[PDB]
Symmetry: D2
Subunit: 343 residues, 4 copies
């Protein structure tokens, strides 16, 4: 077994054909453009391999055995390490000037990044919604045959978002007849808000007091909005939220009780999911900046639109920031109950 | 023309075969091991493409036309930007534990990075000398190769290296002509005079240990600075491989260093900077590779051979680094007032 | 002379006071928050030092001596290397969770990064125009400052900016003289001819959608390319602040772009490249800052900050937009030996 | 409360005095040299703050409550993220040429990085042994210090190091009890059996047999407590034999819930050692670029001598087939 054979370098290193050269006008920098994209695609393949392995662990029930959480979090962390490298990799293509790009651009048409199957597969499998996608036209229209079918499978199969959702719905602590997290949280917040009101009311009529009253009212609205299941359902329908109400409860349970042993690695998983969303957005941003630098202000706009919350699959995990409360309002988990979160 | 066809993804993305899986025992992390190496090899190919284009520019004489220096420096800078990414890319393989690596390591034998053709081509073309390579198991590096591959390696050894091509170019650096600006002659005179002046200053100081120490430092510095004008010492150091550039090339490099702000030398100075950067980044690649071997295989050995590679013996442009040793006060540098500052304008 | 004295560590390392601790409730992560900002401010000071040194070189006329270009480009490159580190430095503050930030946030009011003097000085000295700044809370940014600081900010607005100093230098670019190489005249003629040639080949093309689309492209390209020679449109766009450089400076920049390989233009081209880099890296800093505000405070300051991530804050947008006016290499007026040696 | 006051910018941003300027010959790049070092020192202070908080969690017994492992690992991870930035930060000083450095180098003498108190504090608190430190020109490291600073350094030498605190914790790792899961006993047995099995196979070529012999020596050496004690005395190992057993327990059973975050902790300790070494390497490379020849002294610092958690790295050496690992079945799975 030889290195070059093991790595199939006879394929990988014989895959570079400059269209400039095919058309009798070889342009040096075209080679960079080819290699950069091939490297992105190798890493996309690796991301898919990790992400699929993690999807399988959820879908086949292995995640139920918490022995497997370490593997889940290491692979999701690995995805974020790769994406970080992919963001840095734009630095290489920034050594190509627009003037030099302009010398081989003609030989590329009509090929486009839009035709990256793997990038679409990755978006789909994480959980980007097609209805939420900004029109440029459809996206699969640029694909046909087996590729179009792969895309459909990726759209119909359970996404990472859906699989994490189901798992969040089973989070220990949500049972009304058990720790009854939601009931206690609602009560504690109501009481806390009542207490705060009394204090502010006790102050003497002033601009300061009014400013406090106003802030209180805002905080109150936000915190209480959390317990409005109907508003959540409405916001789901508009696609401004993605997780079921019960999954949201599970996520918040993990956030508030992150230090409890059974929740430590789950918390890291939630953190990694947010990281992946952020890094995917950063990839899109750098790509936009690159298109602009090469093609000029007039694609740029469409791609700019992709840098938005509509492409953030785990927006709900980010938005749990909005519902931070004083620590002493969090329902206490005394050791008496702590046992259910021990292992 | 479609993306996947343009990039030949039918080759690139059908090149991943896990030996663990071929032998009926698929190990998840083997996939990462394969892709990481394939990405390194794509970027090695790109480095070779840039490096070869720059070698050609020197070898065919195009570098004589100073209009081409921008392209030369952009491409060498590009090589350093890629290498920096290659150093960062070790962070990905650090997400594989040694325990997990141990589950598929058996299926890899006897394949090894030693068999990376492109890595050897890159070392050769930059200018790593065969006689200066550390032997592994008392064997030649090329003995691991055969056929066309062995022949490519020979070509890479026999064709002009970047070191040789830069050498020739440095030897023609304007300002070295005895009949012209006569840089070396003036430099020797100014340093001798400067050393004399410095001796007088120190000797004028009140007898004190500080003075005694300054005396000691002076004596050291004098020996170093004067050693620069000893062409025989240089030849000796060449023979030992502690230097690599010809004496005259060294003069050219120093000319560029001291007169870097003169228009004609601004981009040449950046070139010299980039060559040092490439050497530093190559060394950092080797270091990170060694640390990786250790974390996976443990101490003992390839480890020790690889550690030997992390050294000045593998730094082709070591001479460019070592010109630091011969820094002098700015006022000792032979003056180039516009009267004589004419040949360094574009 | 001792290290700690040379670096005044008696000041630097006695500058960390946790407000949480001052108020009897020390929160561990507040220390990180303090150090991170102090490090940003050290580097802002270094950027100001480089940028001011470069402004002086322009303003006092030293830049006229082309021997000084290496130092100019090294210092601007150094600014970009620092900013790159400042972008990466967000990774440290991402190790603080929103939950932990929430434990000391109250002790910070009413301090804000908005009040960073140095950040404002930096924006001003590069050339962010006050009338182009997005209002915060329906008010001017400088209202957040008082006394000496307010006065420093005004000086920074009234003194010559990097943009203005580069502009004046670009206006003197060799090659623009009608009586000499006559770059603009020749460029207009060559583009007219090239466009005519394209039309002829297009008109000769077989009636087809391929032709129809080539027609559409041609029309668009023609409009863009000819718009370049419309000085009145430029003046209009200047007035709206959608461009920043004088028409003549734009000509100089384009001269440098097209003849970058000519010896006298090699390092000037690197300077233009670096100025774009600084704008891009400033934008990346703002983007990462926004993403971090969102992660900690949730979903406004957020919306104001998002507004800052835009072309209004790109001082050298005109250097980016010269991509838009890329022409085939053969259209570029020839610089043969006869009229070569001047560069 | 105003930003500049909250951050004490009246101190931080009035701490830049160029000696070149003090001596009537201002050199532009000296400013970069000062700021770079000040930034390093701010971050060293932050690393000390994290590291001390973690040492305290061990020393006050809070680590015993496994609820605190997330905080321990987050802060150690934070240390690694800072060190990574500190490695990248050399890129800034690489924008200073040696020629430009040479214009102000004279005004610096005799100041040196050797006099960085915080760097020494950091080395000490992690667990770099003084007896293992390479001497520079036959001089003690503390010789460069005096007064309260010298006293801080002594405290940092005499107080419990991160290494010692982790050691004690590793010694209490569940599973080592002979009367319980009896990890060590079972591991020794399984390895012996496996080696015997391998013998038989090869007997059933000799080139490979040679390697088998080597593996046996390595694997069996693990169970030689006396060799370990000897190597401890020479400072080629640092952890007690029992701590080593705990670490190996965590390595082999990393997926067991109670060991998942502990495994991450061990990983991060190795990361900190690696990153510290990388910092030293980049610093060496920098000295060489500017002075061109303590280049060789600094090179000596880039060694296993300065790797506090070398034992954690070396557990790679003792990897065995998965099926030799004593099984953690329901019988014992409970713990
Ligand atoms: C010279 C550099 C680049 C230019 C000028 C460029 C140009 C474009 C343009 C204009 C689009 C919008 C679709 C279209 O009109 O064709 C696009 C989309 C895309 N590009 Fe690039 N691109 C560049 C580099 C890259 C790189 C390095 C990647 C990495 C694989 C890439 C992957 C993509 C992908 C996946 C899309 C679709 C993204 C989406 O729809 O959200 N491109 N590119
Ligand atoms: C698990 C990670 C790795 C291990 C354990 C490893 C192991 C080794 C070993 C032991 C050697 C010495 C030759 C031998 O005895 O076989 C070697 C050399 C080499 N490896 Fe790796 N390697 C790793 C990753 C990589 C990667 C990612 C590359 C990238 C292409 C690579 C490229 C090379 C090269 C080019 C050499 C020869 C270098 C020289 O002779 O100076 N290795 N590797
Ligand atoms: C926990 C981390 C951070 C949060 C939550 C945060 C929050 C904010 C907010 C809300 C604003 C808008 C003004 C306001 O309403 O107060 C702002 C502006 C700003 N922050 Fe931060 N910030 C953080 C970290 C940083 C850091 C590390 C820097 C570094 C110096 C910084 C510098 C600034 C600057 C300069 C502005 C003004 C930006 C502009 O007008 O474009 N912030 N920040
Ligand atoms: C121009 C760049 C630099 C040069 C030339 C330089 C030079 C030196 C030299 C020669 C030594 C050996 C002791 C001596 O003889 O003085 C040393 C040690 C040291 N330097 Fe630097 N240094 C540089 C940058 C830095 C930076 C950025 C740091 C960061 C704070 C730093 C911190 C240290 C430390 C802590 C030591 C002690 C190392 C040890 O004993 O392990 N130096 N430096
Ligand atoms: C592979 C091949 C091409 C690309 C591009 C890319 C960038 C700029 C372009 N300008 N024209 N074209 C050709 N067609 C795009 C859609 N219609 C015309 C470009 C293609 C980016 N990534 C690529 C990967
Ligand atoms: C391709 C294939 C293998 C490698 C290795 C590598 C790493 C660790 C190894 N342990 N044993 N082997 C097998 N051979 C090494 C020398 N003779 C037996 C390993 C190979 C590194 N890069 C690779 C690329
Ligand atoms: C120093 C001190 C504070 C900050 C902030 C910051 C972050 C979150 C905040 N929430 N409230 N405040 C108070 N201000 C908000 C508007 N005016 C009062 C915060 C301040 C960011 N960087 C800082 C540096
Ligand atoms: C603060 C101040 C100085 C430094 C140095 C440094 C770098 C190069 C030097 N050359 N001489 N000196 C002064 N003495 C050091 C020992 N013998 C002479 C230098 C000091 C590195 N980091 C610093 C931080
Ligand atoms: C048995 C279980 N692993 C319980 C579970 C579900 N979601 C969680 C989140 C955090 C911690 C535990 C869980 C399962 O049902 O998967
Ligand atoms: C005409 C010339 N380009 C001269 C030359 C040689 N080396 C240099 C270094 C710096 C500046 C100029 C040169 C040539 O002979 O290549
Ligand atoms: C003599 C000159 N340095 C000419 C000049 C102006 N702008 C330029 C741009 C690129 C190259 C040269 C110039 C000066 O007037 O400053
Ligand atoms: C009760 C205990 N937390 C047990 C313990 C010690 N070391 C460990 C390593 C991994 C897992 C658990 C432990 C303690 O004594 O700290």
């Amino acid at each position: 077994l030889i290195y070059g054979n093991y790595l199939h370098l006879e394929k990988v290193l014989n895959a570079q054909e400059l269209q400039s050269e095919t058309k009798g006008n070889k342009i040096h920098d075209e080679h960079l453009f080819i290699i950069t994209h091939q490297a992105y695609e190798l890493w996309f393949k690796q991301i898919l391999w990790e992400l699929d392995s993690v999807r399988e662990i959820f879908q086949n029930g292995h995640v139920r055995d918490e022995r497997n959480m370490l593997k889940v979090v290491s692979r999701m962390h690995r995805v974020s390490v790769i994406l970080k490298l992919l963001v840095q990799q734009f630095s290489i293509l920034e050594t190509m000037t627009a003037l030099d790009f302009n010398d081989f651009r003609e030989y590329l048409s009509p090929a486009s990044g839009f035709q990256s199957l793997q990038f679409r597969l990755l978006e789909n499998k994480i959980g980007v919604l097609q209805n939420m996608r900004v029109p440029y036209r459809h996206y699969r229209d640029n694909f046909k045959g087996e590729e179009n079918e792969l895309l459909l499978k990726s759209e119909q199969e359970k996404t990472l978002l859906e699989l994490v959702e189901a798992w969040l719905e089973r989070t220990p602590g949500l049972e009304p007849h058990g720790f009854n997290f939601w009931g206690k949280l609602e009560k504690n917040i109501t009481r806390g808000l009542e207490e705060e009101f009394i204090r502010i009311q006790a102050k003497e009529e002033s601009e300061e007091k009014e400013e406090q009253v106003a802030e209180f009212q805002k905080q109150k609205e936000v915190l209480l909005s959390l317990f409005d299941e109907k508003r959540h359902e409405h916001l789901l329908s508009k696609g401004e939220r993605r997780l079921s109400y019960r999954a949201l409860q599970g996520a918040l349970m993990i956030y508030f009780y992150r230090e409890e042993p059974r929740f430590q690695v789950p918390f890291q998983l939630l953190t990694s999911l947010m990281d992946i969303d952020s890094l995917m957005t950063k990839w899109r941003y750098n790509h936009v900046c690159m298109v602009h630098r090469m093609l000029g202000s007039k694609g740029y706009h469409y791609l700019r639109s992709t840098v938005s919350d509509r492409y953030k699959v785990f927006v709900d995990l980010f938005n749990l920031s909005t519902y931070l409360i004083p620590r002493h309002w969090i329902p206490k988990m005394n050791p008496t109950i702590h046992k259910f979160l021990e292992h």
